[PDB]
Amino acid sequence: PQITLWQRPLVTIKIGGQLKEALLDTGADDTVLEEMSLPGRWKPKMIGGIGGFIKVRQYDQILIEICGHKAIGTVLVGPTPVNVIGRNLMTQIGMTLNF
Amino acid sequence: PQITLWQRPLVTIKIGGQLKEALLDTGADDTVLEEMSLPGRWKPKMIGGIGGFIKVRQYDQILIEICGHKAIGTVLVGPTPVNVIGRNLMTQIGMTLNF
Numbered sequence: 001p002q003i004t005l006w007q008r009p010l011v012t013i014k015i016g017g018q019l020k021e022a023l024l025d026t027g028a029d030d031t032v033l034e035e036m037s038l039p040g041r042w043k044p045k046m047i048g049g050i051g052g053f054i055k056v057r058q059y060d061q062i063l064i065e066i067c068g069h070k071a072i073g074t075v076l077v078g079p080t081p082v083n084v085i086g087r088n089l090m091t092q093i094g095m096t097l098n099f
Numbered sequence: 100p101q102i103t104l105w106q107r108p109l110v111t112i113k114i115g116g117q118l119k120e121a122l123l124d125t126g127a128d129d130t131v132l133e134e135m136s137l138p139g140r141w142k143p144k145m146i147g148g149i150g151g152f153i154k155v156r157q158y159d160q161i162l163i164e165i166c167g168h169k170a171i172g173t174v175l176v177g178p179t180p181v182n183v184i185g186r187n188l189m190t191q192i193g194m195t196l197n198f
């Protein structure tokens with residue numbers, strides 16, 4: 001389908017047995033979510049944007065369900081003010097920009 | 100046209116008669132550009148980002164070409180890691196997300 005940009009493109013994802021609302025974000029390289037518990041090992045990382053950098057825990061190979069699809073990608077967990085779905089995951093579900 | 104998300108969706112914009120590189124950012128409500136000179140008077144605006152709030156200069160009804168399409172709207176100038184084109188301008192050129 002087609003998602004308009006008149007409003008923030010919000011979606012509900014299923015990850016780690018939880019339902020989280022996030023922003024389909026083309027300006028986000030990776031998916032970044034607020035504090036939550038995830039399985040497996042992780043690596044500390046610093047990501048920057050408007051306002052500066054924040055420290056996050058990088059988890060790889062995380063299964064996430066979005067728009068009915070079951071994709072796999074990297075999830076950065078940290079004190080982000082808004083949950084965002086990055087290009088890392090959007091590519092997997094075949095999402096593109098069109099005009 | 101269609102823009103995939105495997106790489107950052109960087110496009111050429113024209114503002115003030117100069118060509119610049121900007122990132123199509125669906126996670127951004129507004130358009131924030133790196134330090135530059137724009138005509139007329141500006142108003143103050145406080146915008147939030149992943150690292151916190153920052154003060155920017157707000158210029159309205161500014162002519163700006165994005166991917167060759169003409170738009171006239173609000174441009175915010177301030178400390179941003181990269182020029183970002185937000186939903187305010189992407190809506191003007193009829194851009195949407197699709198899958």
Ligand SMILES: CCOP(=O)(COc1ccc(C[C@H](NC(=O)O[C@H]2CO[C@H]3OCC[C@H]32)[C@H](O)CN(CC(C)C)S(=O)(=O)c2ccc(OC)cc2)cc1)OCC
Pocket residue numbers: 025026027028029030031032047048049050051081082084086124125126127128129130131146147148149150151152180181183185
């Ligand atoms: C301090 C509190 O702020 P806030 O009011 C809004 O909180 C955010 C934070 C981040 C974003 C995504 C970025 N958009 C944004 O900042 O938008 C700005 C401009 O429009 C305005 O409206 C939304 C917030 C203004 C952008 O899409 C992606 N970023 C990169 C680029 C902007 C430099 S990012 O989030 O820094 C990022 C994501 C993934 C990464 O992986 C490597 C790296 C970096 C949206 C909203 O809190 C609400 C509770």
